Amino acid sequence: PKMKSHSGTKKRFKVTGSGKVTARKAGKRHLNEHKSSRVTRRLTGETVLSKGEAAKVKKLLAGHPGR
Amino acid sequence: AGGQMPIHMQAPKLGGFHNPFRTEYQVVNLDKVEALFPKGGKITVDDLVSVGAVRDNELVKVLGTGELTVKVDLVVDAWSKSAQEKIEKAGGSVTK
RNA sequence: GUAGCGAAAUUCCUUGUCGGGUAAGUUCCGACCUGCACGAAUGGAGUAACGAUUUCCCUACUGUCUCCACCAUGAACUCGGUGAAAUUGCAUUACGAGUAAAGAUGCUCGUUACGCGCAGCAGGACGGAAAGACCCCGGGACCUUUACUAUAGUUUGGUAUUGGUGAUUGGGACGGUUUUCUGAUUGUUCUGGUUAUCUCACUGUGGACCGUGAUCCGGUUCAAGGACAGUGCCUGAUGGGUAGUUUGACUGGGGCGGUCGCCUCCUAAAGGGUAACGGAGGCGCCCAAAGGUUCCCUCAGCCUGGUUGGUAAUCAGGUGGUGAGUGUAAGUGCACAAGGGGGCUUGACUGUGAGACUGACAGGUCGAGCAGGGACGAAAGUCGGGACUAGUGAUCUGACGGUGGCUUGUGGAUGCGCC
RNA sequence: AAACGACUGUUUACCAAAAACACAGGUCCGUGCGAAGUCGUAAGACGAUGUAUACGGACUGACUCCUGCCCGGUGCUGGAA
RNA sequence: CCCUAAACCGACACUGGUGGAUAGGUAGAGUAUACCGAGGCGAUCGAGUGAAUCGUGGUGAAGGAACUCGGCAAAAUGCCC
RNA sequence: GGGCUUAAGUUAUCCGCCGAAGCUGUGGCAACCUGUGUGGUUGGGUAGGGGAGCGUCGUGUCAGUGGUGAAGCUGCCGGGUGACUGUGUGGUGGAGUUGAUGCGAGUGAGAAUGCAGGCAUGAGUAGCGUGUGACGGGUGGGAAUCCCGUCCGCCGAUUAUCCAAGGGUUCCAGGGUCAAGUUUGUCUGCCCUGGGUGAGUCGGGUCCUAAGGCGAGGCCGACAGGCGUAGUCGAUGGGUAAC
RNA sequence: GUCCGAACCCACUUCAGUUGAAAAUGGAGGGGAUGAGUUGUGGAUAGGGGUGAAAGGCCAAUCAAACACCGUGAUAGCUGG
RNA sequence: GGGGCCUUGUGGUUCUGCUGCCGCAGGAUUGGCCAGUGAGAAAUGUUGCGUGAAGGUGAAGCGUCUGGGAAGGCGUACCGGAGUGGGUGAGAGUCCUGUAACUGUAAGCGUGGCACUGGUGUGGGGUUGCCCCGAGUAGCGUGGGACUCGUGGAAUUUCGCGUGAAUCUGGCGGGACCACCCGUCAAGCCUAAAUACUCCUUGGUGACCGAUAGUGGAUGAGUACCGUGAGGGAAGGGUGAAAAGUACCCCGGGAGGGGAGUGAAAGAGUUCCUGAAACCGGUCGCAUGCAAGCCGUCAGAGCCUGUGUGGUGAUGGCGUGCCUUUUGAAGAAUGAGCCUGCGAGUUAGUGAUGCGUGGCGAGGUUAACCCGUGGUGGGGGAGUCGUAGCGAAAGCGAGUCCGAUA
RNA sequence: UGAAUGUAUAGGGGUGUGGGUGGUAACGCGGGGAAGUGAAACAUCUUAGUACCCGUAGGAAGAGAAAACAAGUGUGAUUCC
Ligand SMILES: [Mg+2]
Ligand SMILES: [Mg+2]
Ligand SMILES: [Mg+2]
Ligand SMILES: [Mg+2]
Ligand SMILES: [Mg+2]
Ligand SMILES: [Mg+2]
Ligand SMILES: [Mg+2]
Ligand SMILES: [Mg+2]
Ligand SMILES: [Mg+2]
Ligand SMILES: [Mg+2]
Ligand SMILES: [Mg+2]
Ligand SMILES: [Mg+2]
Ligand SMILES: [Mg+2]
Ligand SMILES: [Mg+2]
Ligand SMILES: [Mg+2]
Ligand SMILES: [Mg+2]
Ligand SMILES: [Mg+2]
Ligand SMILES: [Mg+2]
Ligand SMILES: [Mg+2]
Ligand SMILES: [Mg+2]
Ligand SMILES: [Mg+2]
Ligand SMILES: [Mg+2]
Ligand SMILES: [Mg+2]
Ligand SMILES: [Mg+2]
Ligand SMILES: [Mg+2]
Ligand SMILES: [Mg+2]
Ligand SMILES: [Mg+2]
Ligand SMILES: [Mg+2]
Ligand SMILES: [Mg+2]
Ligand SMILES: [Mg+2]
Ligand SMILES: [Mg+2]
Ligand SMILES: [Mg+2]
Ligand SMILES: [Mg+2]
Ligand SMILES: [Mg+2]
Ligand SMILES: [Mg+2]
Ligand SMILES: [Mg+2]
Ligand SMILES: [Mg+2]
Ligand SMILES: [Mg+2]
Ligand SMILES: [Mg+2]
Ligand SMILES: [Mg+2]
Ligand SMILES: [Mg+2]
Ligand SMILES: [Mg+2]
Ligand SMILES: [Mg+2]
Ligand SMILES: [Mg+2]
Ligand SMILES: [Mg+2]
Ligand SMILES: [Mg+2]
Ligand SMILES: [Mg+2]
Ligand SMILES: [Mg+2]
Ligand SMILES: [Mg+2]
Ligand SMILES: [Mg+2]
Ligand SMILES: [Mg+2]
Ligand SMILES: [Mg+2]
Ligand SMILES: [Mg+2]
Ligand SMILES: [Mg+2]
Ligand SMILES: [Mg+2]
Ligand SMILES: [Mg+2]
Ligand SMILES: [Mg+2]
Ligand SMILES: [Mg+2]
Ligand SMILES: [Mg+2]
Ligand SMILES: [Mg+2]
Ligand SMILES: [Mg+2]
Ligand SMILES: [Mg+2]
Ligand SMILES: [Mg+2]
Ligand SMILES: [Mg+2]
Ligand SMILES: [Mg+2]
Ligand SMILES: [Mg+2]
Ligand SMILES: [Mg+2]
Ligand SMILES: [Mg+2]
Ligand SMILES: [Mg+2]
Ligand SMILES: [Mg+2]
Ligand SMILES: [Mg+2]
Ligand SMILES: [Mg+2]
Ligand SMILES: [Mg+2]
Ligand SMILES: [Mg+2]
Ligand SMILES: [Mg+2]
Ligand SMILES: [Mg+2]
Ligand SMILES: [Mg+2]
Ligand SMILES: [Mg+2]
Ligand SMILES: [Mg+2]
Ligand SMILES: [Mg+2]
Ligand SMILES: [Mg+2]
Ligand SMILES: [Mg+2]
Ligand SMILES: [Mg+2]
Ligand SMILES: [Mg+2]
Ligand SMILES: [Mg+2]
Ligand SMILES: [Mg+2]
Ligand SMILES: [Mg+2]
Ligand SMILES: [Mg+2]
Ligand SMILES: [Mg+2]
Ligand SMILES: [Mg+2]
Ligand SMILES: [Mg+2]
Ligand SMILES: [Mg+2]
Ligand SMILES: [Mg+2]
Ligand SMILES: [Mg+2]
Ligand SMILES: [Mg+2]
Ligand SMILES: [Mg+2]
Ligand SMILES: [Mg+2]
Ligand SMILES: [Mg+2]
Ligand SMILES: [Mg+2]
Ligand SMILES: [Mg+2]
Ligand SMILES: [Mg+2]
Ligand SMILES: [Mg+2]
Ligand SMILES: [Mg+2]
Ligand SMILES: [Mg+2]
Ligand SMILES: [Mg+2]
Ligand SMILES: [Mg+2]
Ligand SMILES: [Mg+2]
Ligand SMILES: [Mg+2]
Ligand SMILES: [Mg+2]
Ligand SMILES: [Mg+2]
Ligand SMILES: [Mg+2]
Ligand SMILES: [Mg+2]
Ligand SMILES: [Mg+2]
Ligand SMILES: [Mg+2]
Ligand SMILES: [Mg+2]
Ligand SMILES: [Mg+2]
Ligand SMILES: [Mg+2]
Ligand SMILES: [Mg+2]
Ligand SMILES: [Mg+2]
Ligand SMILES: [Mg+2]
Ligand SMILES: [Mg+2]
Ligand SMILES: [Mg+2]
Ligand SMILES: [Mg+2]
Ligand SMILES: [Mg+2]
Ligand SMILES: [Mg+2]
Ligand SMILES: [Mg+2]
Ligand SMILES: [Mg+2]
Ligand SMILES: [Mg+2]
Ligand SMILES: [Mg+2]
Ligand SMILES: [Mg+2]
Ligand SMILES: [Mg+2]
Ligand SMILES: [Mg+2]
Ligand SMILES: [Mg+2]
Ligand SMILES: [Mg+2]
Ligand SMILES: [Mg+2]
Ligand SMILES: [Mg+2]
Ligand SMILES: [Mg+2]
Ligand SMILES: [Mg+2]
Ligand SMILES: [Mg+2]
Ligand SMILES: [Mg+2]
Ligand SMILES: [Mg+2]
Ligand SMILES: [Mg+2]
Ligand SMILES: [Mg+2]
Ligand SMILES: [Mg+2]
Ligand SMILES: [Mg+2]
Ligand SMILES: [Mg+2]
Ligand SMILES: [Mg+2]
Ligand SMILES: [Mg+2]
Ligand SMILES: [Mg+2]
Ligand SMILES: [Mg+2]
Ligand SMILES: [Mg+2]
Ligand SMILES: [Mg+2]
Ligand SMILES: [Mg+2]
Ligand SMILES: [Mg+2]
Ligand SMILES: [Mg+2]
Ligand SMILES: [Mg+2]
Ligand SMILES: [Mg+2]
Ligand SMILES: [Mg+2]
Ligand SMILES: [Mg+2]
Ligand SMILES: [Mg+2]
Ligand SMILES: [Mg+2]
Ligand SMILES: [Mg+2]
Ligand SMILES: [Mg+2]
Ligand SMILES: [Mg+2]
């Protein structure tokens, strides 16, 4: 049978043109008042995963190209 | 992950949405057009770019990375501004 | 906490104390009350009779014993027949003092010992038999309850079954008395609450009759109820009656106690890092100034003089470099002040981030330069909160504001996305 | 002679026969009969071919003398501004 | 045909369990017990041998619970008038 | 440990030797690096990673081979760095199977208190299930254990006799001694063959009902089903004619 | 629901057995033995249920939820191989 | 849309009543386009085909050699629309059974199809005044279920309980809802084929098993046996080509053996092919009764043998099992009495992701299915991956996104 | 024929007209409907509408001739791949 892809991984991770795995930075959904604009700038970007985490995400995606 | 909140839970969900009616433009470049129609392709068409390679039964947008030293009449579905500018500079045209 | 009872089937201390019994009595039985922690239908205190119940004593009686002996028998033992069992890494399987996974037939150093049988005894082979029940850890089961979430049942009201006619009580329709109105209303319709009636709805019932010569059942009828009850659906309450489950870890075993994230110091062995239920403390804030900027100032202590006034309030002179101070722990800092004061302000900005620091990662931290638009300063310039480092919470889901990217035939709407 | 249970009985087949259970007696609560209670989805049935001197539940446990104070908590019963 | 069993229930040709009927004599209250009757059996490995020891019985000087957690077991008592 | 001071004790110092799978010499194997004439470095190893193989079975193809003896089994003589092996040589055996090269695996066992069978160990050991047998004669290949007889002992509210339940041919006669019988056995409740059970009255049915079961219709229940009327069964009882 | 005591029913003590004669018995005593007695035959109650003079006892020789089959090759961060 | 209202049209008529002495309908052998045993508003005899169940025919070899036996060897011929097998005393194309090919089928309830009989039967155009078009239904509310959708922005669909419509200028659907547009006409019914399956029947097949395997079952197998019952549930295959199964004699009561016969073989004698290991013995060689032994190993005398290598081994040195699990085990931690057999990394996906290798290459590749009853081959490009990325997306595009066209 | 009873029905008496009963390996349709398991606990969810069960077929069944899709043209019953 076909292998299903992981739903959370589908919704959370992207794969770039060069095979890099990127996610959205965590920690900016709420409780933003005490955070400086510098902290929000650090948390508003797009993070590139480490090699091990990227391999795990690629295993979780059943060939799904990411969101 | 051993009980630690796993990456696929700690990372925030990329939100957004998908366009239900999004169409994807098969793209051909001026490098490829020049290479596959070197003898000054007079009137290239969707069928001609398909017999070369455009993956037919799709819209056949033409993009403009290249030089296009020849004169060519593209007759395709949509084109980029730089591609159009290069085409009229070389002396060709686009249609549709 | 009464009557009564009490070192008791209850008394920890405890062999309480006294008295009886014995030559000697932690037991006994009668008392004391100092009841750790009696007590009146989970009955209190008694009680003739009863007890293969528990306890103490006397007598009789005895191999229970001093202290065993002897006799006969079923096994044991020899011969003939028949003929298992658990167990089993191995074998030509000594002792001593050692050594080693800390208890050796098997290793070391020594000592002793001819080969093989038979009857015996149980010190060892950590002997055999049962993948320890005790303990802990994982799972399960059943039990309990004011654990959680449900549920049968019981119960509430609505509504359907469900109709007829009334009164007695509230809200309008509605005009046309009042006085559209603070206040009164009536009639003409409409709609709630409550309540009493009526009866080929219904009740599964009391009598009679018939199916039938049947204590079932049904039908007819009478009586009694009666739109109630019953039942369906919806709904609130109740519900260990029942069901599924949860009930953390660390820990010099576990339990109890304590602890769990963040910050500072020491341990920490002069980079960084470094554990213990190691040694000390803090944090879950605060401040519209205690932020920004610009200019100005120097403290604490000590000595002397001085109304109230004293060690110490305010004042003067002298001395005094950090020992004062710092919103808040501690350290590193800060007198060039980052400490004290005045002026003007909102940078406690928007768009950014070269380049680095630090973590397994999520992440945490610093940051030049630039644009916009400001504050302060004559300018140089400084300003993306606070001398620095704690004052915090990923994701999910939902919410508000803005934006308008998307919207399933189109236009809206609605929903979503983005910030 | 003391403790316990009044007694005869009953009980852990296969480690406990007892001071445990039962018991006669006692009290409280429920039940007006299609009873309450119980089995069952229901019809039915037991209760009972019984009718409050009965039936069901609870605790106590022959007999003698007795059974005190507390309704704040919880439960039950009644009441409904 | 077996049938208070070698034939049934116990895996056995198993010192266990299995309902009913008949059931004489003497001693005796007796269907207890002893020895016998009607009738039936000698039991399904034997032969020996004074070992220790274990089981099962027997007797015991003087003492008489000194035993032991405890008079456990045994002994004594026992019937009729 | 023996023993040692007459050091074989301590200490300073000198001269020798012993001593490892270390080093060196010699011979073989292997991995890697290197310019590729040389040479250099390396080769303990659990978990584990990489590489290259042995053996078994099936199978495509080619070459074959086999009663002048395949497979299997079992000796001897050999071979390889290993799993293993000989195209050496016998024995047993009686119908298949070898080499090359591919292909496919139910492809390798010493452990799982593993499963099945066979067989050891304990061991000629414990036991042979309450007891009283003795003798004379007989039978027989064989007799404590079979038959007959005589003594003796045992049971006798049962070790007797007859039923029910249950069993099912064990009953009788004759033949038998592999197995079974806790020994032996000529014997048997065993084996083999044949035979044996006679009812108007006995015990049941043809008669009766109890508890209880089933239950025409029926009532109840989503279905499945529950209950129950009329009935109809059901002895452990009633009724019923022989000694 | 008297007394002593056989049958009968029981199971208090002790010894033996404990690879037993026996997966609970045997020897010696012991309790009840006209009663809430005991026993034969047939029947009824069934597994979250039965029944229980109540021990969580018993329900076909292991019952804090029987047995058989099925879901099923349940699952096991554990032990073994 | 239909009914109605009309302008016409019914198969050529014997020539009946009614509507108007117009027309309508019954009528009757006869055409007849047709249509038929089907779901089709229906269902009743005679004639044309190859066959299934049984059968029939079915080609073509001898001679020598060794052997118990020829299918083997050697020589030499034949058949083949037949060389697929399986038998026969060993390995057969021509010995047997068959096979190829052809043929028969009477019969079937036969069956399938055809002809005949026989049975059944037209519309087109206009019109809209009117009439009809499936009701406790659709909807709505509520409590549940199914839809990717787990109550939600909740369409569509469904059950219980309430409530309850329009009906053509109408109803429903197009994911709340409304409008328009597009589609469609629910609340009546029947419908072959492609699809699923095998207790059975017939034929065939297997890099499937070969008696601990394969069914539990190659045999009295759901049997023996166990359980009250539901239920559980085995083990045991092989003489030889042919019984020619050992006449007769001897020891023995027999059992068993010894002679002899049968047979190629009897050490193939029925417990019978082959006959391994554990295990149990006889014989021979050496060692062993002064010795402390994880049982071996290295050194090594003597003896035996010499089939000149082998067997044995006095005596000396060194030396604490295997596995598991462990910081650490000879361990007095676990498991194993012994041998033989059996017993654990598999398989399936046009799964995911690497690598090796082969093909093709800016292209690669098919899936279902169709053809090949002749297979493993050919077709099939629907799809799918590569061919452009960036963005939540509109979109833009070698750029894009955040941003101010920074 | 017609009860109570008036209509009449229930019922009763004929007649025998037709059908039913039960079995069956898989496949079908309609309905009822687990748990172990997974989620490293667990309750939503999962397992799974699976196991099992009830009713009921046929040689196949079910479905089926648009109150359908589509999205601007169009497709034209259902089933299956
Ligand atoms: Mg947000
Ligand atoms: Mg902010
Ligand atoms: Mg956590
Ligand atoms: Mg005292
Ligand atoms: Mg005390
Ligand atoms: Mg005293
Ligand atoms: Mg009181
Ligand atoms: Mg009280
Ligand atoms: Mg008390
Ligand atoms: Mg009392
Ligand atoms: Mg008292
Ligand atoms: Mg008393
Ligand atoms: Mg007693
Ligand atoms: Mg005395
Ligand atoms: Mg003896
Ligand atoms: Mg002997
Ligand atoms: Mg030590
Ligand atoms: Mg020692
Ligand atoms: Mg030693
Ligand atoms: Mg040794
Ligand atoms: Mg000995
Ligand atoms: Mg001995
Ligand atoms: Mg010992
Ligand atoms: Mg032990
Ligand atoms: Mg134990
Ligand atoms: Mg254990
Ligand atoms: Mg246990
Ligand atoms: Mg639990
Ligand atoms: Mg249990
Ligand atoms: Mg109600
Ligand atoms: Mg109501
Ligand atoms: Mg009234
Ligand atoms: Mg009335
Ligand atoms: Mg009235
Ligand atoms: Mg409870
Ligand atoms: Mg509970
Ligand atoms: Mg669970
Ligand atoms: Mg835990
Ligand atoms: Mg502790
Ligand atoms: Mg712990
Ligand atoms: Mg440091
Ligand atoms: Mg350091
Ligand atoms: Mg550390
Ligand atoms: Mg300052
Ligand atoms: Mg702020
Ligand atoms: Mg940077
Ligand atoms: Mg920090
Ligand atoms: Mg600026
Ligand atoms: Mg200025
Ligand atoms: Mg500050
Ligand atoms: Mg400041
Ligand atoms: Mg979550
Ligand atoms: Mg659409
Ligand atoms: Mg922003
Ligand atoms: Mg007293
Ligand atoms: Mg006392
Ligand atoms: Mg008593
Ligand atoms: Mg009493
Ligand atoms: Mg008593
Ligand atoms: Mg009893
Ligand atoms: Mg007992
Ligand atoms: Mg009473
Ligand atoms: Mg009632
Ligand atoms: Mg009654
Ligand atoms: Mg009491
Ligand atoms: Mg009160
Ligand atoms: Mg009170
Ligand atoms: Mg109240
Ligand atoms: Mg008898
Ligand atoms: Mg017996
Ligand atoms: Mg028997
Ligand atoms: Mg007498
Ligand atoms: Mg007697
Ligand atoms: Mg006699
Ligand atoms: Mg007899
Ligand atoms: Mg016997
Ligand atoms: Mg002797
Ligand atoms: Mg005596
Ligand atoms: Mg004497
Ligand atoms: Mg004496
Ligand atoms: Mg005397
Ligand atoms: Mg005396
Ligand atoms: Mg004493
Ligand atoms: Mg003493
Ligand atoms: Mg005594
Ligand atoms: Mg005595
Ligand atoms: Mg050396
Ligand atoms: Mg070396
Ligand atoms: Mg060397
Ligand atoms: Mg190596
Ligand atoms: Mg080395
Ligand atoms: Mg390894
Ligand atoms: Mg040959
Ligand atoms: Mg072979
Ligand atoms: Mg090969
Ligand atoms: Mg294998
Ligand atoms: Mg083996
Ligand atoms: Mg075995
Ligand atoms: Mg032996
Ligand atoms: Mg002997
Ligand atoms: Mg012995
Ligand atoms: Mg002996
Ligand atoms: Mg003996
Ligand atoms: Mg005897
Ligand atoms: Mg005898
Ligand atoms: Mg005799
Ligand atoms: Mg006698
Ligand atoms: Mg007598
Ligand atoms: Mg008979
Ligand atoms: Mg016979
Ligand atoms: Mg027999
Ligand atoms: Mg006989
Ligand atoms: Mg014998
Ligand atoms: Mg005989
Ligand atoms: Mg005989
Ligand atoms: Mg009769
Ligand atoms: Mg009856
Ligand atoms: Mg019926
Ligand atoms: Mg009768
Ligand atoms: Mg009868
Ligand atoms: Mg009495
Ligand atoms: Mg009896
Ligand atoms: Mg006892
Ligand atoms: Mg004992
Ligand atoms: Mg008495
Ligand atoms: Mg019964
Ligand atoms: Mg208890
Ligand atoms: Mg039992
Ligand atoms: Mg349970
Ligand atoms: Mg499952
Ligand atoms: Mg498992
Ligand atoms: Mg273990
Ligand atoms: Mg022929
Ligand atoms: Mg030939
Ligand atoms: Mg319609
Ligand atoms: Mg709708
Ligand atoms: Mg709804
Ligand atoms: Mg759903
Ligand atoms: Mg709806
Ligand atoms: Mg729409
Ligand atoms: Mg249909
Ligand atoms: Mg088999
Ligand atoms: Mg074999
Ligand atoms: Mg076998
Ligand atoms: Mg049976
Ligand atoms: Mg031959
Ligand atoms: Mg042979
Ligand atoms: Mg054999
Ligand atoms: Mg053989
Ligand atoms: Mg010697
Ligand atoms: Mg030694
Ligand atoms: Mg350890
Ligand atoms: Mg060991
Ligand atoms: Mg050992
Ligand atoms: Mg262990
Ligand atoms: Mg072991
Ligand atoms: Mg084994
Ligand atoms: Mg395409
Ligand atoms: Mg049928
Ligand atoms: Mg669950
Ligand atoms: Mg779970
Ligand atoms: Mg788990
Ligand atoms: Mg159909
Ligand atoms: Mg059509």
Coordinates of N, CA and C (backbone and C1' of nucleotides) in Angstrom, one line a residue, chain H residues 104-124:
Chain H
rG104 P -19.3 -37.9 -37.5 O5' -20.0 -38.8 -36.4 C5' -20.2 -40.2 -36.7 C4' -20.6 -40.9 -35.4 C3' -21.7 -40.2 -34.6 O3' -23.0 -40.4 -35.1 C1' -19.9 -40.9 -33.2
rU105 P -24.1 -39.2 -35.0 O5' -24.4 -39.1 -33.4 C5' -24.9 -40.2 -32.7 C4' -25.0 -40.0 -31.3 C3' -25.6 -38.7 -30.8 O3' -27.0 -38.7 -30.7 C1' -23.5 -39.1 -29.7
rA106 P -27.8 -38.0 -31.9 O5' -28.9 -39.1 -32.3 C5' -28.5 -40.5 -32.5 C4' -29.4 -41.4 -31.7 C3' -30.1 -40.9 -30.5 O3' -31.2 -40.0 -30.7 C1' -29.1 -43.0 -30.0
rA107 P -31.1 -38.5 -30.1 O5' -32.1 -38.6 -28.8 C5' -32.8 -39.7 -28.5 C4' -32.3 -40.2 -27.1 C3' -32.4 -39.2 -26.0 O3' -33.7 -39.0 -25.5 C1' -30.4 -40.4 -25.8
rG108 P -34.6 -37.8 -26.1 O5' -34.8 -36.8 -24.8 C5' -33.8 -36.0 -24.3 C4' -33.1 -36.7 -23.1 C3' -32.9 -35.8 -21.9 O3' -32.9 -36.6 -20.7 C1' -30.8 -36.3 -22.8
rC109 P -34.1 -36.5 -19.7 O5' -34.9 -35.2 -20.1 C5' -36.2 -35.0 -19.8 C4' -36.6 -33.5 -19.8 C3' -36.2 -32.8 -21.0 O3' -37.0 -32.9 -22.2 C1' -35.6 -31.5 -19.1
rG110 P -36.5 -33.6 -23.5 O5' -34.9 -33.3 -23.5 C5' -34.4 -32.0 -23.9 C4' -33.2 -31.7 -23.1 C3' -32.6 -30.3 -23.4 O3' -33.3 -29.3 -22.6 C1' -30.9 -31.9 -23.6
rU111 P -33.8 -27.9 -23.2 O5' -32.4 -27.1 -23.6 C5' -31.5 -26.9 -22.6 C4' -30.1 -26.5 -23.2 C3' -30.2 -25.4 -24.3 O3' -30.3 -24.1 -23.7 C1' -28.9 -27.1 -25.0
rG112 P -31.4 -23.0 -24.3 O5' -30.5 -22.3 -25.5 C5' -29.3 -21.7 -25.2 C4' -28.5 -21.6 -26.4 C3' -29.1 -20.9 -27.6 O3' -29.2 -19.5 -27.6 C1' -27.9 -22.8 -28.3
rG113 P -30.5 -18.7 -28.0 O5' -30.5 -18.7 -29.6 C5' -29.6 -17.9 -30.3 C4' -29.3 -18.4 -31.6 C3' -30.5 -18.4 -32.6 O3' -30.7 -17.1 -33.2 C1' -29.4 -20.5 -32.8
rC114 P -32.2 -16.7 -33.6 O5' -32.5 -17.5 -35.0 C5' -31.7 -17.3 -36.1 C4' -32.1 -18.2 -37.3 C3' -33.5 -18.1 -37.7 O3' -33.9 -17.0 -38.4 C1' -32.8 -20.4 -37.7
rA115 P -35.4 -16.4 -38.4 O5' -36.2 -17.5 -39.3 C5' -35.9 -17.7 -40.7 C4' -36.7 -18.8 -41.3 C3' -38.2 -18.8 -41.0 O3' -38.9 -17.9 -41.8 C1' -37.3 -21.0 -40.6
rC116 P -40.2 -17.3 -41.0 O5' -41.3 -18.5 -40.9 C5' -41.8 -19.1 -42.2 C4' -42.5 -20.4 -41.9 C3' -43.7 -20.2 -40.9 O3' -44.9 -19.9 -41.7 C1' -42.3 -22.0 -40.1
rU117 P -45.7 -18.7 -40.9 O5' -46.5 -19.6 -39.8 C5' -47.6 -20.4 -40.2 C4' -47.8 -21.5 -39.2 C3' -48.6 -21.1 -37.9 O3' -50.0 -21.3 -38.1 C1' -46.5 -22.3 -37.3
rG118 P -50.9 -20.0 -38.0 O5' -50.9 -19.8 -36.4 C5' -51.4 -20.8 -35.6 C4' -50.7 -20.8 -34.2 C3' -50.8 -19.5 -33.5 O3' -52.0 -19.3 -32.7 C1' -48.5 -20.1 -33.6
rG119 P -53.0 -18.2 -33.1 O5' -52.6 -17.0 -32.1 C5' -52.8 -17.1 -30.7 C4' -51.7 -16.5 -29.9 C3' -51.6 -15.0 -29.9 O3' -52.5 -14.4 -29.0 C1' -49.5 -15.9 -30.4
rU120 P -53.3 -13.1 -29.5 O5' -52.3 -11.9 -29.5 C5' -52.0 -11.2 -28.2 C4' -51.0 -10.0 -28.4 C3' -51.5 -8.9 -29.3 O3' -52.3 -8.0 -28.6 C1' -49.3 -9.5 -29.9
rG121 P -53.2 -6.9 -29.5 O5' -52.3 -5.5 -29.4 C5' -52.6 -4.4 -30.2 C4' -51.4 -3.9 -30.8 C3' -51.5 -3.1 -32.1 O3' -51.9 -1.8 -32.0 C1' -49.8 -4.7 -32.3
rU122 P -52.2 -0.8 -33.2 O5' -50.9 0.1 -33.3 C5' -51.0 1.5 -33.7 C4' -49.7 2.1 -34.1 C3' -49.4 3.5 -33.8 O3' -49.0 3.8 -32.5 C1' -48.7 3.1 -36.0
rG123 P -49.2 5.3 -31.9 O5' -48.1 6.1 -32.7 C5' -48.1 7.6 -32.8 C4' -47.7 8.1 -34.1 C3' -47.4 9.6 -34.2 O3' -46.2 10.0 -33.7 C1' -48.7 8.9 -36.0
rG124 P -45.9 11.5 -33.1 O5' -46.0 12.4 -34.4 C5' -44.9 12.6 -35.3 C4' -45.3 13.5 -36.5 C3' -45.6 14.9 -36.1 O3' -44.5 15.7 -35.9 C1' -47.2 14.0 -37.6

